[PDB]
Design a protein around this ligand. Sequence first.
Ligand code: ATP
Ligand code: ATP
Ligand code: MG
Ligand code: MG
Ligand code: ZN
Lengths: 564, 562
Amino acid sequence: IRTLLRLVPAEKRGAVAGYAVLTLLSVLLRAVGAVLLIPLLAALFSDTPSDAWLWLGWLTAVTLAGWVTDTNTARLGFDLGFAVLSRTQHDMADRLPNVAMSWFTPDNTATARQAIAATGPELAGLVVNLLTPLIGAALLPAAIGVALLFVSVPLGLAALAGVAVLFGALALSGRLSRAADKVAGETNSAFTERIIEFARTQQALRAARRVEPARSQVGSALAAQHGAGLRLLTMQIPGQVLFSLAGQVALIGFAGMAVWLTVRGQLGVPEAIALIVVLVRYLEPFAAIADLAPALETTRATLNRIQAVLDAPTLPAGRRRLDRTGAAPSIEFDDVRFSYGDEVVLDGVSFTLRPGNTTAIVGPSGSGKTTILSLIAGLQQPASGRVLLDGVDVTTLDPEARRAAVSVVFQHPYLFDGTLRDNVLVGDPEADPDDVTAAMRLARVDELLDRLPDGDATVVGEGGTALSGGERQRVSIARALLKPAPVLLVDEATSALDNANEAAVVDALTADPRPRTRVIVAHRLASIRHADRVLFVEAGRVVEDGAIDELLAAGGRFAQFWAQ
Amino acid sequence: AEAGSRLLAPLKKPLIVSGVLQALITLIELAPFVLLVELARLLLGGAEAERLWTLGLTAVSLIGLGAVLAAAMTLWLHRVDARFAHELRGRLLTKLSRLPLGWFTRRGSASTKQLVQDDTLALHYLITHAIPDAVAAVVAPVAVLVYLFVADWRVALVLFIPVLVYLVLMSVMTIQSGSKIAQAPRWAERMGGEAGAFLEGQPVIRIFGGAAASRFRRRLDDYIDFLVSWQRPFVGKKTLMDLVTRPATFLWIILVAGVPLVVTGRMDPVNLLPFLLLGTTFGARLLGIGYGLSGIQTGMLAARRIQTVLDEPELVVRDRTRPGTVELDRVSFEYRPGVPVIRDVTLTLRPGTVTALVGPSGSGKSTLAALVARFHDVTQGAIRVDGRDIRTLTADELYRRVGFVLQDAQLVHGSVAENIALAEPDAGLERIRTAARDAQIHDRITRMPDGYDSVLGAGSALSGGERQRVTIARAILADTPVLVLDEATAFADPESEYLVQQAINRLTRDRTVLVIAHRLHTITHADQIVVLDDGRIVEVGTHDELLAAGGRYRGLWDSGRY
Ligand SMILES: Nc1ncnc2c1ncn2[C@@H]1O[C@H](COP(=O)(O)OP(=O)(O)OP(=O)(O)O)[C@@H](O)[C@H]1O
Ligand SMILES: Nc1ncnc2c1ncn2[C@@H]1O[C@H](COP(=O)(O)OP(=O)(O)OP(=O)(O)O)[C@@H](O)[C@H]1O
Ligand SMILES: [Mg+2]
Ligand SMILES: [Mg+2]
Ligand SMILES: [Zn+2]
């Protein structure tokens, strides 16, 4: 299979050569072991059965060598299977944080989820469970045919004639079911994305009464999943019928040549009886191929999903680093253009932030404020134009140096399932308890520890689902403040917090003692307290900017914004 | 297992028949080799040609009959399994529709996916293959060995050596992997949770630590360590079972015991023909169930997990059995036992009134909204809609009486027309444009490439304030007598916030509305303002009354100006 060799590590290519040699050797030894019965029983049925010792000795050597070969083939298949598992999974884990954010469509997120979900024992035992019996079952009839040439040339040709029928059925069986199996996988993958949506959106679905399977989208995805599943069981009937005909046709071809030679004196009766046993050994791989062929098509979809993520377009990067690790950098845009698909968001934004100051961004909803912060942090990159941290382009900046330069508070606080403390520690896991306490106290997360019964060991749900809307927002603020990054981005930190907690958090965003260049995407006029500069963004450009008193005095769009 | 027998009760007669059919089939699959033995015995005996053609052709056809019967039997039994899982999967989705919502929060969306999809898929071998493989692995070794033991006990005893070694290998393999099999589904749930959070929390991972420090990378390494320690001894015992049970292994040990008996005057070579032809056949049946004990162990565990959820408490609609009125009486609630979140709340919401629910963060105002929705039952007290308890109302009646916006603007994978018409999917586009127009989202939807058909999948189509205005459009289209707005217009700008609020006042003029807001300047117009501090109502009154009281509300109002 072409796809799997692409995923093999380069360091293990010595093991694949050894595996292939032992795999071919396994087939050769098994085939020689089968055809070694023809002289053995011919000598055993002869008038001198003592001649049978020579062929039993060779049979013992061939069988013992087979056990050693197939044990080593199993060790290498296990090592190669898990080496591909850890290599691909670690590559996808490394690659995905660098994959472009435009790649995470609902279809690709399903591909990445299924690709990551293939980590189980089924993919790991791929080489042991599929490749080894598939290669052996496919090549064993051909090796017995080649081995039979030393007993009788036309008999070996007849056994090789049925080999061609085996591959004819093997190619056609996959061809017939490929159309239906693709739909079965696609409908089964959609059903996965609806169960996750079903569990993640229960409140909205339940209120809307779209939760019962007769009325729900997951119920519709289940009906399509069942119909495509039953269709696959039906379109696989031709493949199993076709393998049965191949086995029967090979049986007629093998047995027809054996009887034809026997009546003509070219093949003794013990040799003919011995070939009945070789005929059964010859025909067992025909049924083994039939059972393994359906599993071959599901693997091809599994490896394609894994290769789909590995082929995903990583984002541009360089190897530059900032002149100082912790000094406050200047943030500036130089005619930044950006668009989601064909829908433009930004059309020539150009500003410059002084290092170590705090500036605010305000504007209507859907203006582009969150996009601006994403571009600064490097989550997005411009379609054209450039973003410079301390005069150094982020697109040419090291992923490590670029990642370490920014800490952000997102508009929709997402917390990983775990303890409350583990989510704060994500900002800086190496920080000592004195630093973690300072971050929590600034973000008013210390008040949560008193009220909550488990304190900082409170189990956060999926997202911040097991916390209130305002509680998870402060856990997010503590996470951002803990990180020592010299650039702080804040996105609607006020949305879920009451008036008392909002004021303390807003003061804490500037009372943080580190020198940082701060960008505050805010909602209220009070939320932009202590702001050294204000940027008003509307329709994808900074239409107006200045100080709070300056803009209010001018009575511009900044003043009209608060007038409702 | 009791939880497995209860779940698989509908398949009692299909599974009994599959066991009976396979006993007949495997006997039919062994008949050709009994006839080929007689064909071989008569070739040496020089019998008449027409007698050989009878045995030869009957044996070849019986191979075809067994292959046809075997293929047909697995086809029907696979369709019985496919239809059961559809019946079972729909049963689970029906059950999950009714469970209290704390079930979903304490579990996650990755465990629900494992439940509905993976655990039902884990029952495949138990239903479709376990009984066919067990009856084959019993009757075929038993039928062959009894036939061969009559033929020659000396060589037949030697056939027990690989049989006993196989039984020891699978038994040792079964006890070793028994613990790992039970631990396996928990790891899949954890990795699904980590993988889901890894994909969903990508902006957090990209900025905080990247791949190296991510929780998923560590759990990924730990999971593979579990797999290697699980699979190395399991695969190692699997291959020895294959080597022991292979036809080449049986044939070699038949000849090791046979050839010295034939070379010496202790056995005729004719009597080896049953062993050569039939002795090598029953090994593949033995390996069928030996490889299958893991499928039975995983399936029996999955059936236990499935029946556990189907036995869960359900938020039953009890038969105990002013319009638009909602009364809370002595309501208390606990997300977890012994952790009060709501404490003896008594409140009444009347038609043609706006009630504002305010207070500190984490005081339980979203919990009160969820209780009215009956996402959770009140631990104490009662909540009555239009004079009737919501525990007596059915789900259709409850959610036709009251509509909800929930502070967490969840959107489903579908068009904006499908999202705005979530409450009433049969509603027309003219209504959808009207609801969207009132929610101040129609202009945005017009600017989309596909317009009202544009899909709202993952990471697409909307900002945070635009998602909220879509969910307001959904609530408008539902058109229920009662309305609850949990922190709505939180991300809306002041210019857009006024237009949405004015539309809500216009639509719900004569209706019950429960607004929940942290921005107290937006709820000055409320008929009554309810202050919720630490899960209890500390003061109730109008805006001026609460300011003059000088209590919690005055503190919050004064602190709003910074
Ligand atoms: N994933 C996305 N795909 C396509 N368009 C998007 C996406 N996210 C946002 N948009 C659109 O980009 C424009 C700006 O969105 P953005 O999130 O930057 O705005 P914002 O100022 O942060 O808004 P809000 O206050 O509502 O959060 C809007 O048209 C929004 O619809
Ligand atoms: N699913 C849950 N499991 C456990 N505790 C929860 C859950 N949801 C909320 N809580 C806790 O219950 C209390 C109130 O939660 P709730 O969501 O009702 O708060 P709230 O008043 O709406 O908050 P906010 O104003 O911050 O949005 C808080 O302690 C919160 O941590
Ligand atoms: Mg935004
Ligand atoms: Mg809330
Ligand atoms: Zn099956």
